[PDB]
Amino acid sequence: YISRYLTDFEPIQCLGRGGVVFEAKNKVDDCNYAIKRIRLPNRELAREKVMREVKALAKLEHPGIVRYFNAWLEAPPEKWKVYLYIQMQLCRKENLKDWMNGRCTIEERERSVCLHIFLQIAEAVEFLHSKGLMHRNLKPSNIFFTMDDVVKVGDFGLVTKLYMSPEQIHGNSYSHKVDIFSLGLILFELLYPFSTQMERVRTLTDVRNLKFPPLFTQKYPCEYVMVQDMLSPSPMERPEAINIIENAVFEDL
Ligand SMILES: Cc1cc(NC(=O)[C@H](O)c2cccc(F)c2)ccc1-c1cn(C)c2ncnc(N)c12
């Protein structure tokens, strides 16, 4: 037995860890892809549950969704069981976190470029919600850029907490509102740069509890009302993905 992945791609490196994610140039077409290797569940309703998802995911086409290419199953003989591969468009190694941690002044955070980036993330989330799907992984380490500076939501589907909503932590991610919450923090962190890791944690932890820096509440007064809405502590209160994109602040960017 020889595995499909090993014959057809020469691996470059590992990009992710949690399933594993590799970089690998396909030999036929000579382009480098992001490849997610999941070890599958051993049960026969846990297997089939997943395989109904890869079917629904592979149908997704949107500008904020990393471009899909292929999926295939393998089952090799271990030396001492059944891995699923997903070939996805490779993305720039510099994610949203990197981008933010490299621009720490109000000046390097232009109000125009920031709202632009955020809208794309919001529009991608609108799409997924309208398809009856939810992200549940919105956070800067997992918001990406394409070679051509297009923003993409990161990995989701196929089954830190500072960007998780409360219910998500102690509950069952119950509603698609958990994504509205995540967007709130992300919008703030874009418009209010940090100096130190401590500052970031202390201030986000506070903004989870609606304790905002007054300098922010002054500087961006509209944005403040949005981030408040998006954080409304009773889930059912928060806006819908659609409502956020239709907010006045997004007009003639
Ligand atoms: C591994 C990975 C997977 C996805 N999967 C999906 O969106 C989503 O599962 C999906 C599947 C199928 C169709 C469909 F529409 C959507 C998105 C992003 C990355 C990614 C992570 N890391 C660390 C990366 N590093 C460089 N490039 C990268 N693509 C990545």
Author numbering: 585 to 602, 605 to 666, 881 to 959, 987 to 1080
From the paper:
The protein kinase R (PKR)-like endoplasmic reticulum kinase (PERK) is one of three endoplasmic reticulum (ER) transmembrane sensors of the unfolded protein response (UPR) responsible for regulating protein synthesis and alleviating ER stress. Upon activating the UPR, PERK phosphorylates eIF2a at Ser51, leading to widespread inhibition of protein translation with a few selected regulatory proteins translated to restore homeostasis and alleviate ER stress. Herein, we report the synthesis and discovery of a series of novel mandelamide-derived pyrrolopyrimidines (I) that are highly potent, selective, and orally bioavailable PERK inhibitors. These medicinal chemistry efforts were iteratively supported by an X-ray crystallography structure-based approach to develop and refine SAR information.
